[PDB]
Amino acid sequence: MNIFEMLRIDEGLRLKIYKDTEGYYTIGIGHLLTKSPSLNAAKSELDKAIGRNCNGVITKDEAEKLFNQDVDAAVRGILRNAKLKPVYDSLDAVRRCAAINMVFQMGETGVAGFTNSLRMLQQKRWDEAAVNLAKSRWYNQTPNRAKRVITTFRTGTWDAYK
Numbered sequence: 001m002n003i004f005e006m007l008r009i010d011e012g013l014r015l016k017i018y019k020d021t022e023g024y025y026t027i028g029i030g031h032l033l034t035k036s037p038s039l040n041a042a043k044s045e046l047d048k049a050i051g052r053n054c055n056g057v058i059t060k061d062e063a064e065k066l067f068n069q070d071v072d073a074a075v076r077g078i079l080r081n082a083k084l085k086p087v088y089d090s091l092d093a094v095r096r097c098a099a100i101n102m103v104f105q106m107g108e109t110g111v112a113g114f115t116n117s118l119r120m121l122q123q124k125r126w127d128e129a130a131v132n133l134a135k136s137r138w139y140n141q142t143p144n145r146a147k148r149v150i151t152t153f154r155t156g157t158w159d160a161y162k
């Protein structure tokens, strides 16, 4: 188990443009294309991301390459964020995967709201952090995925993905 396998489970794999749980155009392994309601806008973003005229359809290799870029962008975003980096660096490898998973899903807009969760995680107050993480729109809107991520933070094991 690693971050790629974890997010592949949580996001699935689809080779044609689809909509995420919020209704936004997405492709591949959870690659957001646009929040615009315009399918043409999504198709432009796709062609820009892949470097060819895709017509809304990609190959598995292309989906996996976008996925690698997206995971790396999440990691680098954590490392560049003065609030997230100290917490990330305090975690073991399995819990770091849970952190990347959340940033992959929510980006930087969730940083402020998760201030108290981040403190509890840095303090290694795992049960309290798990309770706090569930008091969120994130948990209420995607509860099964959030429960898996939270269990990973609570236990430091892959039990929720096995």
Ligand SMILES: Oc1ccc(OCCc2ccccc2)cc1
Residues within 6 Å of the ligand: 078, 084, 085, 087, 088, 098, 099, 100, 102, 103, 106, 107, 108, 109, 110, 111, 114, 117, 118, 121
């Ligand atoms: O959009 C978000 C949502 C939640 C966040 O924090 C919780 C997960 C985490 C833990 C350690 C290091 C980085 C991230 C950060 C951004």
